[PDB]
Design a protein around this ligand. Sequence first.
Ligand SMILES: CC(C)CCC[C@@H](C)[C@H]1CC[C@H]2[C@@H]3CC=C4C[C@@H](O)CC[C@]4(C)[C@H]3CC[C@]12C
Ligand SMILES: CC(C)CCC[C@@H](C)[C@H]1CC[C@H]2[C@@H]3CC=C4C[C@@H](O)CC[C@]4(C)[C@H]3CC[C@]12C
Ligand SMILES: CC(C)CCC[C@@H](C)[C@H]1CC[C@H]2[C@@H]3CC=C4C[C@@H](O)CC[C@]4(C)[C@H]3CC[C@]12C
Ligand SMILES: Nc1nc(NCCc2ccc(O)cc2)nc2nc(-c3ccco3)nn12
Ligand SMILES: CCCCCCCC/C=C\CCCCCCCC(=O)O
Ligand code: NA
Length: 398
Amino acid sequence: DGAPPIMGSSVYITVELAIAVLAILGNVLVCWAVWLNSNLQNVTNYFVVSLAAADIAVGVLAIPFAITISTGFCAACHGCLFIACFVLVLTQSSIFSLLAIAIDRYIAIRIPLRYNGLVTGTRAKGIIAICWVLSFAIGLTPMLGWNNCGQPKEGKNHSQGCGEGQVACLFEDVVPMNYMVYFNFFACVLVPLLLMLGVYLRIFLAARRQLADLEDNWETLNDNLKVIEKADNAAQVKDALTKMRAAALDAQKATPPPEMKDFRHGFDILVGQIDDALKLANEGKVKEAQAAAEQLKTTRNAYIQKYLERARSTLQKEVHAAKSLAIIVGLFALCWLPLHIINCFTFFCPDCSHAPLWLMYLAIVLSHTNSVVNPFIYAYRIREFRQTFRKIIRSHVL
Ligand SMILES: CC(C)CCC[C@@H](C)[C@H]1CC[C@H]2[C@@H]3CC=C4C[C@@H](O)CC[C@]4(C)[C@H]3CC[C@]12C
Ligand SMILES: CC(C)CCC[C@@H](C)[C@H]1CC[C@H]2[C@@H]3CC=C4C[C@@H](O)CC[C@]4(C)[C@H]3CC[C@]12C
Ligand SMILES: CC(C)CCC[C@@H](C)[C@H]1CC[C@H]2[C@@H]3CC=C4C[C@@H](O)CC[C@]4(C)[C@H]3CC[C@]12C
Ligand SMILES: Nc1nc(NCCc2ccc(O)cc2)nc2nc(-c3ccco3)nn12
Ligand SMILES: CCCCCCCC/C=C\CCCCCCCC(=O)O
Ligand code: NA
């Protein structure tokens, strides 16, 4: 005999209900902000809303299901399976939304000119609907036959006094552990997580490479410039002008990120001034070419230096934003890996004693807290969400 089980159950139920309240309120706020602000109405945030909708359903459905199944109540085994497995649908939907966000940010930084013609809202909405259908198929797969309903625990069934066709509804009695470990964890969770890690790695490498190319063109522009002011040879000045023209056409085609009329004007003055200094160089007028090339220092100061700064800050904002979204993925893995790792010990080590009950429910509670944290990450790291949060709160609550 030990402590009455209702005492520890009261702690678990209260904590679960506290999580459900916060998960609903915070993610309702996220959906409200995107509905309200057109600046937040882009393809990237449609998956953020699909992700927020999954977390609302954790508080509205998954946590009540979790409280129910903790009692071990008698139920038809396939009704028990739906109660046990529905949270796997919502978690799989979250993985699809996170994977789509990473790929979306990869397309945006790799092919900026082709982004809006390739990634549209209509295609995004279709991708979201397909991912929700696949999430139900993956998460509810044990209902298709991969379950332990055919091997019921008759000791627990008779102890709790279940009827005919009923089982004591406990998670590890109806859901097989080889599904949870091989199918759910390895194939459906671990593999997509590693792919997300690789995509974001490709995002950060692409940004670092584009910034280096921008810096390379810039110092190449100034290096040949100081070289022209030195060489007493006309061909030596022509050499610098040619390696100066390539870096000009390079940086021009490098960063367009019509309305950018200055970018064409500022670069047409530059390339046109270089071509002028070239015709002087070919005709042997060395000091006339050196004097013409000194005009570049004005076009550079009045146009080219302004495009480099605007291009660098655009890439730094993309890095900061992809860093914000990668935190979402890291907090997801942090909240869900303990449960998966416990299942591995249960499955792979039959000589190990089972993890204690209090640790099992701490891992369950921890996985539910993930449906609370994302709105905080948005509020702290994305200014457009933070500002829209204030407007909603100050005006409609206060
Ligand atoms: C629109 C929303 C609120 C619908 C909610 C659907 C939920 C509450 C319904 C749909 C299917 C239902 C389950 C289907 C069958 C069984 C087996 C029975 O032996 C115990 C009840 C149980 C486990 C039901 C519990 C309630 C249930 C899970
Ligand atoms: C936070 C994330 C990244 C890491 C989480 C580490 C957790 C999940 C690990 C660290 C130590 C592990 C425990 C150490 C040893 C045992 C005893 C064994 O008989 C059952 C499993 C059990 C109880 C392990 C369960 C999982 C465990 C608690
Ligand atoms: C990036 C990381 C977190 C991926 C997940 C690592 C997992 C798959 C690894 C880390 C620690 C490992 C466990 C550590 C020790 C044991 C005890 C052994 O008797 C059975 C296997 C088992 C239970 C391992 C299973 C696999 C395991 C859980
Ligand atoms: N193993 C497990 N158990 C439970 N609940 C049952 C906890 C339990 C375990 C042993 C026992 O004797 C009584 C209760 N929920 C669970 N959820 C998950 C899970 C969801 C996603 C990944 O792992 N695993 N999981
Ligand atoms: C627009 C977002 C919402 C998209 C529609 C969501 C509806 C998906 C519902 C059911 C999909 C069917 C897959 C269910 C698997 C069968 C298992 C079973 O029920 O026995
Ligand atoms: Na989620």
